Scaffold this motif. Structure first.
Motif, PDB file in Angstrom:
ATOM      1  N   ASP A  62       0.830  -1.192   0.000  1.00 18.08           N
ATOM      2  CA  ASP A  62       0.000   0.000   0.000  1.00 18.08           C
ATOM      3  C   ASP A  62       0.872   1.252   0.000  1.00 18.08           C
ATOM      4  O   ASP A  62       2.014   1.248   0.470  1.00 18.08           O
ATOM      5  CB  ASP A  62      -0.931   0.010   1.213  1.00 18.08           C
ATOM      6  CG  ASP A  62      -1.934  -1.125   1.188  1.00 18.08           C
ATOM      7  OD1 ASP A  62      -2.653  -1.263   0.176  1.00 18.08           O
ATOM      8  OD2 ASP A  62      -2.004  -1.879   2.181  1.00 18.08           O
ATOM      9  N   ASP A  63       0.319   2.333  -0.539  1.00 15.94           N
ATOM     10  CA  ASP A  63       1.024   3.606  -0.574  1.00 15.94           C
ATOM     11  C   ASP A  63       0.999   4.245   0.809  1.00 15.94           C
ATOM     12  O   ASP A  63      -0.056   4.323   1.446  1.00 15.94           O
ATOM     13  CB  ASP A  63       0.393   4.540  -1.606  1.00 15.94           C
ATOM     14  CG  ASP A  63       1.226   5.786  -1.854  1.00 15.94           C
ATOM     15  OD1 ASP A  63       2.373   5.850  -1.364  1.00 15.94           O
ATOM     16  OD2 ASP A  63       0.729   6.704  -2.540  1.00 15.94           O
ATOM     17  N   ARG A  64       2.163   4.691   1.274  1.00 14.78           N
ATOM     18  CA  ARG A  64       2.301   5.357   2.564  1.00 14.78           C
ATOM     19  C   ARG A  64       3.108   6.638   2.419  1.00 14.78           C
ATOM     20  O   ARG A  64       4.010   6.923   3.212  1.00 14.78           O
ATOM     21  CB  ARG A  64       2.940   4.433   3.598  1.00 14.78           C
ATOM     22  CG  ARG A  64       2.093   3.226   3.964  1.00 14.78           C
ATOM     23  CD  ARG A  64       2.868   2.262   4.844  1.00 14.78           C
ATOM     24  NE  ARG A  64       4.097   1.807   4.207  1.00 14.78           N
ATOM     25  CZ  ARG A  64       4.979   0.998   4.776  1.00 14.78           C
ATOM     26  NH1 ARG A  64       4.798   0.529   6.000  1.00 14.78           N
ATOM     27  NH2 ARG A  64       6.072   0.653   4.102  1.00 14.78           N
ATOM     28  N   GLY A  65       2.792   7.433   1.398  1.00 17.42           N
ATOM     29  CA  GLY A  65       3.490   8.676   1.160  1.00 17.42           C
ATOM     30  C   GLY A  65       2.979   9.805   2.035  1.00 17.42           C
ATOM     31  O   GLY A  65       2.202   9.615   2.971  1.00 17.42           O
TER      32      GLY A  65
ATOM     33  N   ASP B 284       8.293   1.578  -8.111  1.00 16.29           N
ATOM     34  CA  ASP B 284       6.991   2.116  -8.491  1.00 16.29           C
ATOM     35  C   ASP B 284       6.376   1.368  -9.670  1.00 16.29           C
ATOM     36  O   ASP B 284       5.302   0.774  -9.534  1.00 16.29           O
ATOM     37  CB  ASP B 284       7.111   3.607  -8.815  1.00 16.29           C
ATOM     38  CG  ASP B 284       8.401   3.947  -9.537  1.00 16.29           C
ATOM     39  OD1 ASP B 284       9.227   3.034  -9.742  1.00 16.29           O
ATOM     40  OD2 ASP B 284       8.590   5.128  -9.898  1.00 16.29           O
TER      41      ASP B 284
ATOM     42  N   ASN C 191       3.416  -1.414  -9.822  1.00 13.90           N
ATOM     43  CA  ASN C 191       2.254  -1.082 -10.637  1.00 13.90           C
ATOM     44  C   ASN C 191       1.909  -2.240 -11.562  1.00 13.90           C
ATOM     45  O   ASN C 191       0.759  -2.694 -11.595  1.00 13.90           O
ATOM     46  CB  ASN C 191       2.508   0.186 -11.457  1.00 13.90           C
ATOM     47  CG  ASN C 191       2.536   1.437 -10.604  1.00 13.90           C
ATOM     48  OD1 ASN C 191       2.321   1.383  -9.394  1.00 13.90           O
ATOM     49  ND2 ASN C 191       2.807   2.575 -11.233  1.00 13.90           N
TER      50      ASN C 191
END
Ligand SMILES: Nc1ncnc2c1ncn2[C@@H]1O[C@H](COP(=O)(O)OP(=O)(O)OP(O)(O)=S)[C@@H](O)[C@H]1O
Ligand SMILES: Nc1ncnc2c1ncn2[C@@H]1O[C@H](COP(=O)(O)OP(=O)(O)OP(O)(O)=S)[C@@H](O)[C@H]1O
Ligand SMILES: [Mg+2]
Ligand SMILES: [Mg+2]
Lengths: 256, 318, 325, 44, 255
Positions: free
Chosen positions: B77-80, C81, C85
């Protein structure tokens, strides 16, 4: 080998408007009995099929089958130049290198001709396997479009459940949930707004919001949309036409 | 289709089943029973049961409200910065009615991979909404989390599981799974686990699936590592020619890289007992020199041969 | 046709993967049973990992293999990234498919970073039900234990001679080539379990021939095409050090190194390998020789002047083998 | 906060607007808000 | 439990749209007599106070008082999901964590229920006391809206001069100045377009242009706007409803 003559020009404009967002390259297959086209997006989630019969042609002459690749962005840009009075004429020579779009009026001498270069992507895969569906239902295209643009705001996944004599749309998201349930009815004034449902087996499967917005942009083609649903099989969303139909094959999502 | 792995099939669903670190697990059980869960950073080696502990604590703390009261953010998951400033803050500001003492839990698993700015933004978020939500980190390395974040949490340093706890839970699994075990086989499983409990369970499952009865030889067939007895014979041989032949045939020609050979030799020598402590430390120094030379770039066969020659000199002489 | 023999002689099925037999038998048992857990094929390059996974993927997934299998390579210009993706887009799509278990072949995962490996472990855990990963690597010491514990490791060993010689016989008869027994032995001992090297050297030897129809390939042709020390040269250097004067030994060493373009490290390694075959009366000879030559090699790697290093090699060998006499 | 509590004598009286790092402290996102807060009076 | 049924679904949509831009977080405190809402600006300057009476709902139970903290963006989003003929129903359980918006219809075809997750908001009861405002002017909402809409482009600060029963809008700038003056009068043909004034003491206050433009977004619920200005108290811009009022509490600037 094509002498396609359309009685109405804007109908093909709505046809390509339905194609627009889903895919950017379609290799049309023009046959003696009409024009067919099939394409799949880059993500292999949505399949678009187009069927155009001779019934939508003032005169048709396609004696030999022709493969026709044509950019839909360029065709949309040039087809926006087609007036409501002019009529479309598609002419292709032997082994076409540039398709010609022709417009002719009836009371005034105004000729509009255009040239479009073709593609040679060398992709003509045509696969159809599902001929049966557990649930068949039809509803106005405006109604279904309203429901999906209503539920796409809350979540990226919209469920279409088919419980006994009822239709249920569910979308659960971060800011909240939403459940739009509708029951079939027969409008006695006109069947244009009537909701018809065929029930064989319960259906429960979820789709994607962006994909569903991609299908529902074809609501300009027809005022009615037919939805065919079945478990563990591609869903079908057709837009009926006088000579054929424009239906979308969509891949559900795995919930585990 | 597929069979559920014993790693997942026999995963502890309660905090009592988790073995190792008895004090920390008991205190976590007391916290789950009472409430008022403090901010924690559970850290340690892989496979000792950190993520399982966090998930069991969250489950016991919440109950039926686990689905809408716990937000899990792994590295997938994105954690930015945007995620911390929007999603975590909205989850903290969410109004969920829970039993008194219980609080929402923000499980940020693998917090060592999070960017520094996200950690800085998380500090004010946890400091402001601490009366409704409580955060729980789980990192392999505790130094990758910024000091401002570590000053607002109770750092938990899980230790490597000892042989006794691993043996106990392995005996439990063998007893509920009807597995034929031998003392040497179980000892080999502990030896190859090296405190990694997930590795122990995976090795037991592989041995049972492949060679049935769990003997030590069967365990040392599914580890794809140099055989500890072969390496011990290579290091402890009184004839240097035999050690050289063993290194050439059973290790170099079989595809074992220099790093694996050095690691196995170091582990065997550390576990050796017949030699004196001074001799043990000197052989360990020779292995360290060889490992250093390999790390510089010189990891050829001649370096391992010289290591064997020095170990032979040290053993036969002195 | 005009293609390298590497792709032409690829194993199109699991029956053509020689050398590795335990891995192939386990993989065939996996496909027959239907249990295909996450796989990690690791070992020396050219052992047949990519060939094995490609053959298995084709065997299971028939014609749909093109759409049901995505072949990745972390070494390319993507980073964490784009790599993530692509994996999530392929694993969570659930496209219109005949069956399931979409396979993802991630090549060169030892170049993936620690955060990337942890993210890959999480993605593997999340999408295990529909997507099976067969992460590929070359060294197991460059992989994090998180990724190592979510995959069934299958070490690949360097191919045994019995296999390399079988593929030699297979390629030779089909390509109409003649390998003299000494040349075949040299190629087998020079490949060191690398079938790709065998194919490349064979194709170069084909191109080298003035008439590539019936001209037999000699030992010298392979030893100069691959660029390796001939056994005769190393043996001559060793015997010159062992039984000749210091000046003559220095002359022979310098002449061989200059004429064959041979670095001192290769000379030391070849001398050690040759002296392993021979027996020594004493043991201090072997101990001192190995230790001194390893020290010389380590000093050569750091840097210096080559004349003193060569003199040190000669002196170390002479002193060690005067210890035995 | 303690100084504010002592100066005002009550918790509700003082109004401290904390600009923390959990929000976007950019000019086009906070300049108007801070100018309005520091220009007029708080409703109380 | 809350069960409030609107005659028209567009009523609550318009009420939300009246103040959905100035504030983001709002407390929907509900009690026996009706719904009272109170949201303060993120700049802590202007306070939006809303009261909805019992007679605005076809059905309204409200067994016990309950506070419904909601985010205005998501609430406006869920409200835009319906037609004018729908009968919006506000459903909330005991100590709710989510508010249910049931969009029924005159004929039961599309019974669609939408749920909105609540938010934790510190409720701040800020009702005004008995205040003797020095001026009380009332003019049609369209008038004031047009003046400030066309006259905020001249300056960032707006001065509504009132002296000797004369209304004057002032916003001075370097490029030019804009002044609009209207006098109180009573019209029998259309009393809704008349101007009234009950001035007690002279006052001359200046407020921000952006905040007046935000205030006139409420010029869609009432034909008139009620303004009560005080020299040493926050202004009160009230829009009288059929059952309540949407009053804006604009605060004065530092002297
Ligand atoms: N003390 C323990 N008692 C029982 N089972 C354990 C214990 N430690 C680990 N396990 C098991 O081994 C696996 C460890 O899973 P995790 O707790 O997720 O690993 P981890 O400790 O988070 O380390 P990672 O995943 O490398 S960061 C699970 O399948 C557990 O069932
Ligand atoms: N066991 C084997 N049986 C048959 N051919 C083999 C075998 N191992 C390697 N080869 C051949 O040697 C080459 C190796 O190709 P790949 O399998 O792609 O290389 P690899 O083993 O995956 O290692 P790399 O360098 O990491 S791509 C191909 O031309 C194969 O045909
Ligand atoms: Mg973990
Ligand atoms: Mg490869």
């Amino acid at each position: 080998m094509l002498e396609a003559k359309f009685e109405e020009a804007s109908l093909f404009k709505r046809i390509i408007d339905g194609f627009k967002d889903c895919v950017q390259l379609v290799n049309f297959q023009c046959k003696e009995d009409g024009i067919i086209a099939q394409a799949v997006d880059d993500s292999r989630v949505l399949l678009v099929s187009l069927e155009i019969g001779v019934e939508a042609f003032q005169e048709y002459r396609c004696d030999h089958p022709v493969t026709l690749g044509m950019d839909l962005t360029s065709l949309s840009k040039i087809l926006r130049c087609g007036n409501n009075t002019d009529t479309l004429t598609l002419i292709a020579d032997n082994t076409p290198d540039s398709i010609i779009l022709l417009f002719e009026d009836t009371k005034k001498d105004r000729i509009a001709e255009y040239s479009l270069k073709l593609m040679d992507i060398d992709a003509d895969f045509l696969k159809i396997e599902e001929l049966q569906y557990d649930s068949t239902l039809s509803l106005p295209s405006s109604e279904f479009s309203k429901i999906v643009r209503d539920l796409s705001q809350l979540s990226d996944s919209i469920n279409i459940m088919i419980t006994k004599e009822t239709i249920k749309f569910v979308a659960d998201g971060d800011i909240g949930s939403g459940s739009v349930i509708i029951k079939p009815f027969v409008d006695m004034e006109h069947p244009e707004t009537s909701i018809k449902l065929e029930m064989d087996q319960p259906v429960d499967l979820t789709f994607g919001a962006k994909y569903l917005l991609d299908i529902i942009k074809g609501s300009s083609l027809s005022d009615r949309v037919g939805i065919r649903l079945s478990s563990e099989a591609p869903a079908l969303f057709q837009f009926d036409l006088k000579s054929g139909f424009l239906q979308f094959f969509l891949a559900p999502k795995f919930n585990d | 289709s597929l069979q559920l792995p014993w790693v997942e099939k026999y995963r502890p669903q309660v905090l009592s089943d988790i073995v190792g670190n008895k004090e920390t697990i008991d205190r976590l059980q007391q916290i789950a029973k009472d409430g008022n869960m403090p901010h924690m950073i559970i850290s340690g080696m892989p496979g000792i049961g950190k993520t399982t502990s966090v998930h069991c604590l969250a489950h016991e703390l919440l109950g039926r409200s686990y689905a809408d009261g716990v937000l899990e953010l792994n590295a997938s998951d994105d954690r930015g910065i945007d995620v911390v400033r929007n999603q975590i803050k909205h989850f903290a500001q969410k109004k969920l009615h829970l039993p008194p003492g219980k609080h929402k839990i923000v499980i940020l698993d693998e917090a060592d991979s999070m960017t520094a700015g996200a950690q800085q933004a998380l500090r004010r978020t946890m400091e402001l909404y601490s009366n409704s939500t409580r955060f729980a980190f789980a990192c392999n390395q505790s130094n990758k989390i910024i000091e401002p974040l570590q000053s607002r949490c109770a750092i938990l340093r899980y230790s490597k599981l000892s042989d006794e706890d691993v043996l106990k839970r392995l005996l439990q699994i063998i007893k509920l799974e009807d597995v034929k075990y031998t003392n040497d086989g179980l000892e080999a499983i502990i030896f190859t686990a090296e405190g990694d409990m997930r590795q122990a369970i995976n090795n037991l499952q592989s041995t049972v699936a492949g060679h049935g009865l769990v003997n030590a030889d069967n365990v040392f067939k599914i580890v794809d590592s140099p055989h500890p007895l072969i390496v011990k014979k290579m290091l402890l041989a009184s004839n240097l020619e035999d050690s050289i032949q063993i290194l050439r045939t059973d290790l170099w020609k079989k595809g074992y890289s220099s790093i694996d050979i050095v690691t196995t030799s170091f582990r065997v020598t550390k576990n050796l007992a017949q030699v004196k402590e001074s001799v043990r430390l000197e052989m360990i120094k020779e292995i360290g020199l060889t490992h250093m030379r390999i790390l510089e770039g010189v990891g050829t066969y001649l370096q391992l041969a010289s290591m064997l020659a020095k170990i032979h000199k040290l053993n036969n002489k002195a | 046709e005009n293609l390298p023999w590497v792709e032409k002689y690829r194993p199109e099925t699991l029956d053509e993967v020689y050398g590795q037999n335990e891995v192939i038998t386990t993989v065939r048992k996996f496909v027959d049973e239907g249990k295909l857990p996450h796989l990690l094929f690791y070992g020396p390059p050219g052992t047949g990992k990519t060939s094995t996974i490609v053959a298995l993927a084709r065997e299971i997934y028939g014609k749909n293999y093109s759409n049901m299998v995505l072949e990745l390579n972390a070494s390319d210009d993507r980073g964490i990234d784009v790599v993530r993706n692509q994996i999530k887009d392929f694993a969570s799509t659930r496209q219109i498919f005949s069956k399931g278990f979409k396979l993802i072949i991630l090549d060169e995962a030892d170049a993936m970073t620690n955060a990337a490996q942890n993210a890959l472990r999480r993605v593997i855990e999340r999408y295990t039900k529909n997507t099976r990963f067969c992460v590929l690597a070359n060294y197991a010491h460059k992989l994090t234990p998180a990724l190592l514990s979510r995959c069934t490791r299958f070490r690949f060993q360097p191919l045994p001679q019995e296999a390399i010689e079988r593929r030699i016989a297979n390629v030779l008869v089909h390509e109409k080539l003649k390998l003299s027994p000494n040349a075949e032995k040299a190629l087998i001992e020079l490949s060191n379990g690398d079938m790709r090297r065998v194919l490349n050297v064979l194709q170069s030897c084909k191109a080298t021939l003035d008439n590539p129809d019936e001209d037999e390939i000699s030992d010298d042709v392979i030893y100069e095409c691959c660029g390796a020390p001939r056994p005769s040269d190393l043996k001559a250097v060793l015997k010159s050090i062992l039984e000749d004067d210091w000046g003559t030994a220095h002359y022979t060493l310098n002449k061989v190194r200059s004429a064959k373009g041979l670095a001192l490290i290769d000379l030391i390694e070849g001398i050690v390998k040759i002296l392993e075959d021979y027996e020594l009366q004493n043991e201090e000879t072997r101990v001192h020789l190995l230790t001194k030559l390893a020290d010389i090699e380590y000093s050569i790697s750091k840097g210096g002047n080559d004349q003193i290093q060569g003199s040190a090699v000669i002196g170390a060998i002479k002193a060690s083998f005067e210890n035995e006499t | 906060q303690t100084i504010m509590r002592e100066i005002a004598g009550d918790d509700n009286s003082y109004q401290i607007y904390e600009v923390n790092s959990n929000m976007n402290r950019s000019k086009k996102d906070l300049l108007d808000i801070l100018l309005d807060f520091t220009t007029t009076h708080y409703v109380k």
